[PDB]
Amino acid sequence: LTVKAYLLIARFSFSFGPCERLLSRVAALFPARPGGFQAHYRDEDGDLVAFSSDEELTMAMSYVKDDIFRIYIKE
Amino acid sequence: LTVKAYLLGKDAAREIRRFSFSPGPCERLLSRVAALFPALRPGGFQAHYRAERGDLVAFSSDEELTMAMSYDIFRIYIKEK
């Protein structure tokens, strides 16, 4: 997928643990600490639901069919 | 089969988490909740669900949960101990 990060912004690619590999890729891309932010995705109700495990990222792989995974990050 | 566990903080939500669900039922459900939320520890929270009229009603037994699931998404509301 093409991940579109959002700081509450980035565009990188992901080739599919995949979770921390994605979280560390964001942590290393954005210079400002690992374990100091919280990843999120947008559900069908419009809320921002946090995910931090392989179990949850798969459910996020469901809730994005816009060809681009959008992640909103609180620090 | 899809639990959307709200984390109450400040009557309002703080951290929303969603996961699939199907070793009792209530224990497994509480086990997944204490493992998905970093702020939560086992035995240090209270799971709820909305009644037909909207009131938050707490549960902690498999006998409650099977009846509590009578209402395609199961929404749980968690209060910290």
Three-state secondary structure call for residue B5: strand
- Tell me the two tokens of residue B21: 């669900």
A49 touches chain B (CB under 8 A): yes
Residue A52: closest CA among A7, A5, A10, A20: A20
Instruction: Looking at the complex, report in whole angstroms how far the Cα of residue B60 sits from the nearest Cα belonging to chain A.
Output: 24
C-beta of residue B57 within 8 angstroms of C-beta of residue B49: yes
Among A47, A52, A55, the residue with its CB nearest the CB of B16 is A47
| Rounded CA separation A5/B11 (Å) | 30
Experimental approach was X-ray
Report the residue of chain A nearest B21, measured CA to CA.
A55
Rounded to whole angstroms, the Cα distance separating B19 from B1 reads 8
- What chain B holds in terms of domains, given with CATH numbers, is 1-81 (3.10.20.90)
Structural contact between residues A2 and A69, judged by C-beta atoms closer than 8 angstroms: yes
